[PDB]
Write a protein that holds these residues in place. Structure first.
Motif, PDB file in Angstrom:
ATOM      1  N   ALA A   1      33.919  46.067  42.518  1.00  0.00           N
ATOM      2  CA  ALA A   1      35.022  45.259  43.038  1.00  0.00           C
ATOM      3  C   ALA A   1      36.367  45.829  42.604  1.00  0.00           C
ATOM      4  O   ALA A   1      37.260  46.067  43.434  1.00  0.00           O
ATOM      5  N   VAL A   2      36.527  46.060  41.299  1.00  0.00           N
ATOM      6  CA  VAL A   2      37.777  46.621  40.797  1.00  0.00           C
ATOM      7  C   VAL A   2      38.086  47.952  41.474  1.00  0.00           C
ATOM      8  O   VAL A   2      39.236  48.224  41.839  1.00  0.00           O
ATOM      9  N   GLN A   3      37.082  48.812  41.646  1.00  0.00           N
ATOM     10  CA  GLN A   3      37.369  50.132  42.185  1.00  0.00           C
ATOM     11  C   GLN A   3      37.748  50.057  43.662  1.00  0.00           C
ATOM     12  O   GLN A   3      38.653  50.774  44.110  1.00  0.00           O
ATOM     13  N   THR A   4      37.062  49.204  44.438  1.00  0.00           N
ATOM     14  CA  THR A   4      37.464  48.960  45.823  1.00  0.00           C
ATOM     15  C   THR A   4      38.931  48.558  45.902  1.00  0.00           C
ATOM     16  O   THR A   4      39.716  49.136  46.670  1.00  0.00           O
ATOM     17  N   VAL A   5      39.317  47.557  45.105  1.00  0.00           N
ATOM     18  CA  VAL A   5      40.707  47.116  45.116  1.00  0.00           C
ATOM     19  C   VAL A   5      41.637  48.276  44.774  1.00  0.00           C
ATOM     20  O   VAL A   5      42.603  48.543  45.493  1.00  0.00           O
ATOM     21  N   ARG A   6      41.363  48.985  43.671  1.00  0.00           N
ATOM     22  CA  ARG A   6      42.206  50.119  43.275  1.00  0.00           C
ATOM     23  C   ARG A   6      42.354  51.129  44.410  1.00  0.00           C
ATOM     24  O   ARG A   6      43.440  51.682  44.625  1.00  0.00           O
ATOM     25  N   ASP A   7      41.258  51.419  45.118  1.00  0.00           N
ATOM     26  CA  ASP A   7      41.315  52.348  46.237  1.00  0.00           C
ATOM     27  C   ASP A   7      42.158  51.807  47.375  1.00  0.00           C
ATOM     28  O   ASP A   7      42.666  52.589  48.188  1.00  0.00           O
ATOM     29  N   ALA A   8      42.286  50.482  47.461  1.00  0.00           N
ATOM     30  CA  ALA A   8      43.130  49.878  48.486  1.00  0.00           C
ATOM     31  C   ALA A   8      44.543  50.458  48.462  1.00  0.00           C
ATOM     32  O   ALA A   8      45.070  50.867  49.498  1.00  0.00           O
ATOM     33  N   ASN A   9      45.173  50.511  47.283  1.00  0.00           N
ATOM     34  CA  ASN A   9      46.564  50.951  47.224  1.00  0.00           C
ATOM     35  C   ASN A   9      46.938  51.457  45.833  1.00  0.00           C
ATOM     36  O   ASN A   9      46.618  50.805  44.830  1.00  0.00           O
ATOM     37  N   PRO A  10      47.614  52.611  45.722  1.00  0.00           N
ATOM     38  CA  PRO A  10      47.943  53.139  44.387  1.00  0.00           C
ATOM     39  C   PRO A  10      48.722  52.168  43.507  1.00  0.00           C
ATOM     40  O   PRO A  10      48.815  52.387  42.294  1.00  0.00           O
ATOM     41  N   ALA A  11      49.288  51.101  44.081  1.00  0.00           N
ATOM     42  CA  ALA A  11      49.987  50.108  43.265  1.00  0.00           C
ATOM     43  C   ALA A  11      49.039  49.326  42.371  1.00  0.00           C
ATOM     44  O   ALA A  11      49.491  48.699  41.407  1.00  0.00           O
ATOM     45  N   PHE A  12      47.747  49.343  42.698  1.00  0.00           N
ATOM     46  CA  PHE A  12      46.762  48.521  41.953  1.00  0.00           C
ATOM     47  C   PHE A  12      45.880  49.402  41.070  1.00  0.00           C
ATOM     48  O   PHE A  12      44.763  48.979  40.764  1.00  0.00           O
ATOM     49  N   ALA A  13      46.382  50.553  40.629  1.00  0.00           N
ATOM     50  CA  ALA A  13      45.569  51.519  39.854  1.00  0.00           C
ATOM     51  C   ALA A  13      45.345  51.053  38.416  1.00  0.00           C
ATOM     52  O   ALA A  13      44.663  51.773  37.681  1.00  0.00           O
ATOM     53  N   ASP A  14      45.926  49.923  38.029  1.00  0.00           N
ATOM     54  CA  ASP A  14      45.806  49.457  36.627  1.00  0.00           C
ATOM     55  C   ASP A  14      44.869  48.254  36.609  1.00  0.00           C
ATOM     56  O   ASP A  14      44.611  47.728  35.520  1.00  0.00           O
ATOM     57  N   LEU A  15      44.356  47.861  37.773  1.00  0.00           N
ATOM     58  CA  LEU A  15      43.388  46.771  37.767  1.00  0.00           C
ATOM     59  C   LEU A  15      42.262  47.076  36.784  1.00  0.00           C
ATOM     60  O   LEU A  15      41.576  48.095  36.902  1.00  0.00           O
ATOM     61  N   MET A  16      42.079  46.205  35.805  1.00  0.00           N
ATOM     62  CA  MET A  16      41.143  46.502  34.726  1.00  0.00           C
ATOM     63  C   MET A  16      39.675  46.380  35.114  1.00  0.00           C
ATOM     64  O   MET A  16      39.284  45.481  35.850  1.00  0.00           O
ATOM     65  N   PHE A  17      38.870  47.308  34.598  1.00  0.00           N
ATOM     66  CA  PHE A  17      37.446  47.083  34.456  1.00  0.00           C
ATOM     67  C   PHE A  17      37.205  46.217  33.230  1.00  0.00           C
ATOM     68  O   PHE A  17      38.116  45.954  32.437  1.00  0.00           O
ATOM     69  N   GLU A  18      35.966  45.772  33.063  1.00  0.00           N
ATOM     70  CA  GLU A  18      35.649  44.997  31.874  1.00  0.00           C
ATOM     71  C   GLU A  18      36.075  45.758  30.628  1.00  0.00           C
ATOM     72  O   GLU A  18      35.842  46.963  30.504  1.00  0.00           O
ATOM     73  N   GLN A  19      36.732  45.057  29.722  1.00  0.00           N
ATOM     74  CA  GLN A  19      37.201  45.638  28.480  1.00  0.00           C
ATOM     75  C   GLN A  19      36.309  45.132  27.370  1.00  0.00           C
ATOM     76  O   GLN A  19      35.977  43.945  27.339  1.00  0.00           O
ATOM     77  N   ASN A  20      35.904  46.039  26.488  1.00  0.00           N
ATOM     78  CA  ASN A  20      35.119  45.700  25.312  1.00  0.00           C
ATOM     79  C   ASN A  20      33.874  44.887  25.668  1.00  0.00           C
ATOM     80  O   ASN A  20      33.599  43.839  25.089  1.00  0.00           O
ATOM     81  N   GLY A  21      33.102  45.381  26.628  1.00  0.00           N
ATOM     82  CA  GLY A  21      31.861  44.697  26.935  1.00  0.00           C
ATOM     83  C   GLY A  21      31.033  44.441  25.691  1.00  0.00           C
ATOM     84  O   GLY A  21      30.959  45.292  24.790  1.00  0.00           O
ATOM     85  N   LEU A  22      30.405  43.270  25.623  1.00  0.00           N
ATOM     86  CA  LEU A  22      29.520  42.917  24.524  1.00  0.00           C
ATOM     87  C   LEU A  22      28.269  42.255  25.098  1.00  0.00           C
ATOM     88  O   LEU A  22      28.360  41.437  26.021  1.00  0.00           O
ATOM     89  N   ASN A  23      27.098  42.656  24.592  1.00  0.00           N
ATOM     90  CA  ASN A  23      25.827  42.035  24.947  1.00  0.00           C
ATOM     91  C   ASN A  23      25.117  41.605  23.672  1.00  0.00           C
ATOM     92  O   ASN A  23      25.120  42.338  22.673  1.00  0.00           O
ATOM     93  N   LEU A  24      24.519  40.415  23.715  1.00  0.00           N
ATOM     94  CA  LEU A  24      23.584  39.970  22.690  1.00  0.00           C
ATOM     95  C   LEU A  24      22.308  39.526  23.381  1.00  0.00           C
ATOM     96  O   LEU A  24      22.348  38.959  24.475  1.00  0.00           O
ATOM     97  N   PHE A  25      21.169  39.783  22.754  1.00  0.00           N
ATOM     98  CA  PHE A  25      19.927  39.477  23.428  1.00  0.00           C
ATOM     99  C   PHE A  25      18.884  39.114  22.393  1.00  0.00           C
ATOM    100  O   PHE A  25      18.927  39.581  21.247  1.00  0.00           O
ATOM    101  N   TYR A  26      17.940  38.287  22.828  1.00  0.00           N
ATOM    102  CA  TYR A  26      16.878  37.769  21.982  1.00  0.00           C
ATOM    103  C   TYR A  26      15.637  37.635  22.844  1.00  0.00           C
ATOM    104  O   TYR A  26      15.728  37.403  24.054  1.00  0.00           O
ATOM    105  N   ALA A  27      14.476  37.798  22.220  1.00  0.00           N
ATOM    106  CA  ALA A  27      13.212  37.756  22.938  1.00  0.00           C
ATOM    107  C   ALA A  27      12.159  37.253  21.973  1.00  0.00           C
ATOM    108  O   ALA A  27      12.158  37.637  20.804  1.00  0.00           O
ATOM    109  N   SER A  28      11.287  36.377  22.455  1.00  0.00           N
ATOM    110  CA  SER A  28      10.229  35.833  21.614  1.00  0.00           C
ATOM    111  C   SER A  28       8.932  35.721  22.395  1.00  0.00           C
ATOM    112  O   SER A  28       8.925  35.293  23.553  1.00  0.00           O
TER     113      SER A  28
END
Ligand SMILES: CCCCCCCCO[C@@H]1O[C@H](CO)[C@@H](O)[C@H](O)[C@H]1O
Ligand SMILES: CCCCCCCCO[C@@H]1O[C@H](CO)[C@@H](O)[C@H](O)[C@H]1O
Ligand SMILES: CCCCCCCCO[C@@H]1O[C@H](CO)[C@@H](O)[C@H](O)[C@H]1O
Ligand SMILES: CCCCCCCCO[C@@H]1O[C@H](CO)[C@@H](O)[C@H](O)[C@H]1O
Ligand SMILES: CCCCCCCCCCCCCCCC(=O)O
Ligand SMILES: CCCCCCCCCCCCCCCC(=O)O
Ligand SMILES: CCCCCCCCCCCCCCCC(=O)O
Ligand SMILES: CCCCCCCCCCCCCCCC(=O)O
Ligand SMILES: CCCCCCCCCCCCCCCC(=O)O
Ligand SMILES: CCCCCCCC
Ligand SMILES: CCCCCCCC
Ligand SMILES: CCCCCCCC
Ligand SMILES: CCCCCCCC
Ligand SMILES: CCCCCCCC
Ligand SMILES: CCCCCCCC
Ligand SMILES: CCCCCCCC
Ligand SMILES: CCCCCCCC
Ligand SMILES: CCCCCCCC
Ligand SMILES: CCCCCCCC
Lengths: 333, 333, 333, 333, 333
Positions: free
Chosen positions: B76-103
């Motif tokens: 989604a972010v990359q599509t928008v950015r490709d729309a117009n060079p004015a939107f080249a700073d639209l962020m991707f996820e910053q500092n992704g974090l995952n936690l997971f548990y399984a039993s």
């Protein structure tokens, strides 16, 4: 693999997944295996391909293959494309599909390969469509090879509201007979005919080629390590109202199991004495240098084999920027 | 690793740290391990990632991972950015974090993955904010898989002095059921609905996608050497008032222990029979080449494994400039 | 080696020639060795460096080292240089010299490191002068670590007939205390203050930075094969009348003896939850993706060891133009 | 080889074909061998060179060598060439030739090296001529080293009908005395006087350099693994009415037989305390970073040894584009 | 192979498929083999070449070879091509063919090599024709070598309606006599005479060259491992009314079996004392640097051998862009 067959000069003694398509009884002699030609989707050289051959009981084999493109089809389409840059979108075969089956009934093995491809881009600015279909039927008993390759359909057309182009096959037939005197000697004859008709944005074009070949291939008393071979072929090729060639290709080469992890393949060819191409109009003759060689390798890890060509062979280099090309991966179960 | 899952065509038969996120019961089957995807900080492909999975009891596992970005989000972010060079700073996820548990509690193993990300740049000439949050819950008893993936939040906005733009998930649900009649065969069904609203400096955009997938993946009788596999999937995708595709991808591949230091991975796929994307308005059909392949390796030093893709796979080469890409490192305790 | 400490995330659990300068009791624990950092003379990255550490009796150690440059000094000098192409010759430390000594009295080991550098170019069109001098004092009994890094002098000035610039240190203290509850865990805290005055062709500048860090580092049961570690640190940095930052880096990595000839090193780190930098002027906050990793190797020939970084780690690549960077050579006697 | 001596910092402790020319008694200690410095013909760096040393009795050695060029001669010619593009054709020594002979008469080994070179291009538009001739006489008894190197003729001249240039030696003398207190320690002193004159298209020039060196080099006790060494030298150089330098180089290094196939070599040096060059006219002092290192390998195949420099040392990289440079080949009979 | 003969200074002591053409008794001494010189078709360097030698009873050998080009012929053509870009199409030999035979008649072995080539492009815009034919006859009893190489036909001509050009051989004779006092020494003498006539678009040219050589070559007493050799030769060449040269090439090299999988080859040469070329007209002398060296390798896999030159030998590097050039492949049955 393609790189293997090419380094072995496409000689008729070679048994390979890639020679079996047009000699489908070969699918019965091949080991059960999966093979993948490395490459890319779309208009790419190499183009991605791959498939498998499986045994079905003791006396038959079958399999499928993805992405195979006919030499004749791609040549025709590329000729059109090179004619005018407005024809850039003329399609190669899309989503090529092969099915094949072979069966040994006593002393005769027969096999069949079916080829189909079809695709379209109905976007008005592109407007392309391509279809192909054909068959190879063949049989052999170890002494006699009978091979028939018949095209049914081959058409590609373009119409984008600006220009129009099309190219179509009006007949494709390839017939081959081989006689093996011993496990070391084979003689063979081959007749091929294709008719192609094109319309480039108004201007019609026709090409009709007929070619006769008679040849022989010899191998050495089977070594467990080295398959050395040599061949001679006479080749007569007539392009209607274009030209006529009479060529005597002499070739030789070797496949050597050089190490537990390494197969080396090399061959060299030249047209000896008979090398002339004559113009039907002027009768002027072209008779130019024809010496050519080929080299490749297989990296063996038991059931895994990575085949390739020596990318530097035409320049005489092995260096880290020119090592392997035309890579394929084969897993023999 | 990413390169391993990609060389194995993303087949559902694979068990990997990278397949576990959206099938968290898998976390209970992986060996305790730490893994790092080579890459860079920020807007880089590959992006640095890494994490671990540890055994808590004899019936549970848990861990955390850094840097994972949602594919939907980045698209989604990359599509928008490709729309117009004015939107080249639209962020991707910053500092992704995952936690997971399984039993593993009975014959049922269950698991949960939580994902969160959040960043902002309040410089007035930049002014950007991005957030995402989602869960995945799953359970299996070996015969039946139930996997649910839920997007709670996905938003990226840009407001500098000159232009604005934003893009936002209005619902992301993904549901898979799988049935294993044997260790060699699985059938699976999958439904995915997603809605995305964006604003491109006043102009609003809305994309809604629903897809249905039914497929089967088979593996050979487990050997210590060569895991061969093939699958068939039929996939209907509908982008509202936009397009509809009906595809039948067919694939096969192999993971081979070629040497004590060497794993080889390869696969090939093509859309067979069904390959059509129809445009909604015009009804024009797109039906183009789908052949594709993949090649990777693992280099093995006992508890350390270095995974990679063959960088030259799409051009058929292996050489000093095209050896290993998409490298990852894994230490199995 | 630099590449070894970098691949091990600069963690405090590491014992290396390169971590001993600011922890001189470590010189007692190192093996008698000579190390050389590959690089060039002058303004080169990497910069040629190298030295040795030798035992004196069973209770003292000493050595010298050539080429080392202070991180803070070069940061200052580069900041000025970047301010304007006319300060392009502002010097880094010239002919750095380090001397160091360590002794284990009873249960306490203490050591000191002296740093001095000095150089000038009196060409009228260059006219530059730079000097630095500092000391490190530290003691440890295995359970408690006391480390003082103190700067005495750090000045770099430039005067050609066109412009003048000078940067000068008005204070640099670093104090660290570590506590080891076991050989597997360590907590630590660190205060750093630094004052710097500069004059850029008339404009005066002041930067004063104060930082507090509390952190934790754990390793797994001392093993003979794989050294796995992870850490957490919270870090508060204040730049007077400019900026404040609160960051919580979490990191994890492994050093593994993967073969008789190979050590593999890798780590990943991210700022988790706390990643905020706020301009003092505007209160504007920057909170952007911070995921990062590092990968290196050691090639072992008994007493010779060649350390490096995987030059392609930031692009996910191993190939022949991206193999080893940041090479160092260590001979251990 | 050149790469070997260079990686060992040119230390006086080294015994190599390349150090023997100016210390001819060394030809008696070298194993009968043939060496080839890889390179090109003409104005090429590296320049092709090669030759041999052979025993005669048990007490004498002799041999010849092709391609050696004087550093002073090449320095002079290059400086003139660089004064003006008109002087581009000024010749380096042509077809350098060395004859050498060493004999041991009791406790004293003595030896002499003779150097000759001569060539011309009488094409009127080139009009060049160059000649050189010199001798080295030396003797050692283990404790005492006496080495004298004496130029005889050093002249290169150019007259192409548009410009004239010449450079000419007016005396080249270099005297060295060394004392070995033991097999591990040597102190040495050296005086070098040279006077050069040149005419650059009618402008006359003179350069009289005089230099004094006193130094010391130590090795560890003889171990068949890793010859470690360090040294320090003070050197005063006066270029009459131009410049003066006082320099205190300190250096260390290792030659390590790290595998059956690999010799590793490395060294680092820095001028400590004394690093000053003063311009005689203005008294302006230049005093800049001098840290420098060096690294190379020997690839060993029993009697065959390929020596090289790590071509990436000045940038800290080892990769397939920066592997080996300054290659030489040496066959020990 | 060519790389092998070249790295061995082209010395008369070398027995190789590439030195047998002009010393055909050697075909009796060669093991039965096939060889391929990697390269391309047409105007390419290296040019695809290849052939075989086979035994036929205990006292005879024969075989054939494709692609070989005469050095004199290619030199003549290339010089004409360089004279004017209107001659760009003047042909080198086309489809070169060699047949050879050799027989041991008692203590004498004699042999014969037949060379023929012929090609043409009768397109009116190219209009080219080229033809060559020659013979070598030679015999040896181990003590006396008699070699006669004779050129029958040698012509290449161009006529495109705009320009004409032609070059033709009015005579080519090459006689060599050699005497072996032992298996380690050989002295030899050689006379060579050639007249070449040309017409460049009405401008006639003649070039008559006569040369005499007397040389000596020595090897050491045969080791099973390290074949060392050295030679001296004096060569006088006179090109009628143009130029003369007197040259004393001295040279030396080694072929070393360095490992089960490696042959290393290196030599070096220089013109000692005699190196002068006089312009017949002005009497002006040229006497410039002549040092040169050569380095190559054989990679040995039992019956397969890949020979190459070290591509980086002229610049002193071994790296991944400069490893192997002039590759050839040889299979010894
Ligand atoms: C080693 C002697 C081989 C002699 C072969 C003579 C046969 C002549 O055939 C000619 O071959 C060339 C090859 O292209 C043709 O161009 C000529 O037209 C033939 O006459
Ligand atoms: C040689 C195997 C025969 C398979 C023939 C299938 C008949 C139709 O095939 C598909 O037709 C659609 C129509 O567009 C194509 O898009 C598919 O790629 C074909 O497989
Ligand atoms: C499944 C983990 C969810 C826990 C995180 C809740 C609050 C985290 O706060 C943010 O952490 C991110 C990293 O994702 C930082 O970049 C932000 O600055 C924090 O606000
Ligand atoms: C590691 C501390 C040792 C102290 C170094 C000795 C102080 C001498 O400094 C020298 O000053 C001259 C200039 O006068 C410089 O050129 C030298 O590089 C310094 O060693
Ligand atoms: C587009 C016109 C160009 C000419 C096209 C010729 C027909 C191409 C189709 C090939 C079918 C026959 C192939 C048999 C099996 C195989 O070789 O894959
Ligand atoms: C900018 C919005 C575009 C649409 C993107 C929607 C996706 C955001 C929600 C995150 C999904 C995380 C699912 C948890 C398991 C996993 O790590 O895959
Ligand atoms: C350009 C001025 C910026 C200020 C930089 C601070 C200069 C102090 C340098 C000495 C500190 C290091 C001494 C301890 C031993 C070591 O780390 O080598
Ligand atoms: C060419 C202009 C002058 C430059 C200085 C020339 C120095 C004298 C050269 C004569 C050769 C002296 C070397 C003899 C020692 C040896 O045997 O290596
Ligand atoms: C057009 C240029 C004329 C060049 C004249 C020289 C070549 C004519 C003779 C052909 C070469 C014969 C060589 C015989 C043995 C061999 O080396 O194979
Ligand atoms: C089994 C082969 C031995 C080593 C060959 C190495 C070739 C580069
Ligand atoms: C596992 C035996 C050696 C394989 C080497 C392959 C390298 C190209
Ligand atoms: C397992 C024998 C040696 C393999 C050498 C591979 C060189 C690419
Ligand atoms: C220590 C066994 C060989 C591992 C080779 C890895 C090279 C890619
Ligand atoms: C012990 C066999 C290792 C071979 C390494 C292959 C290098 C790519
Ligand atoms: C098995 C011998 C050591 C291998 C060293 C390889 C370093 C690139
Ligand atoms: C298995 C012996 C060492 C292999 C070195 C591989 C590095 C390319
Ligand atoms: C059998 C030879 C040992 C390994 C040589 C490797 C040289 C790069
Ligand atoms: C132990 C056999 C030699 C290993 C050579 C590896 C060279 C990269
Ligand atoms: C099989 C012995 C060592 C091979 C080393 C190959 C180095 C390229």
């Amino acid at each position: 693999s393609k790189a293997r067959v090419e380094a072995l000069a496409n000689s008729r003694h070679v048994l390979d997944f890639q020679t079996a398509f047009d000699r489908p009884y070969q699918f019965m002699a091949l080991s059960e295996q999966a093979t993948i030609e490395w490459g890319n989707t779309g208009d790419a050289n190499p183009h991605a391909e791959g498939g498998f051959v499986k045994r079905h009981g003791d006396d038959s084999a079958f399999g499928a293959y993805f992405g195979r493109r006919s030499a004749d089809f791609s040549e025709a389409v590329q000729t059109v494309r090179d004619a005018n840059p407005a024809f850039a979108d003329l399609m190669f075969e899309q989503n090529g599909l092969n099915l094949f089956y072979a069966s040994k009934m006593g002393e005769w093995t027969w096999g069949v390969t079916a080829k189909y491809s079809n695709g379209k881009n109905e976007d008005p600015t592109v407007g392309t469509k391509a279809t192909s279909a054909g068959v190879a039927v063949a049989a052999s008993n170890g002494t006699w090879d009978f091979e028939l390759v018949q095209g049914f359909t081959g058409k590609s057309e373009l119409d984008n509201g600006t220009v129009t182009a099309e190219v179509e096959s009006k007949g494709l037939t390839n017939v081959t007979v081989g006689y093996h005197m011993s496990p070391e000697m084979e003689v063979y004859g081959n007749v091929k005919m294709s008719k192609v008709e094109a319309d480039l944005n108004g201007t019609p074009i026709e090409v009709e080629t007929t070619s006769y070949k008679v040849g022989m291939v010899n191998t050495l008393a089977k070594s467990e390590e080295g398959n050395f071979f040599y061949g001679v072929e006479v080749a007569s090729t007539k392009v209607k109202d274009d030209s006529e060639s009479l060529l005597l290709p002499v070739y030789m080469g070797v496949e050597h199991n050089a190490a537990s992890w390494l197969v080396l393949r090399a061959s060299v060819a030249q047209n000896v004495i008979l090398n002339e191409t004559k113009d039907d109009a002027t009768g002027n003759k072209t008779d130019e240098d024809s010496t050519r060689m080929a080299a490749g390798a297989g990296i063996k890890f038991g059931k895994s084999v990575i085949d390739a060509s020596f990318a530097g062979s035409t320049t005489g280099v092995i260096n880290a920027n020119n090592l392997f090309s035309q890579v394929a991966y084969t897993y023999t179960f």
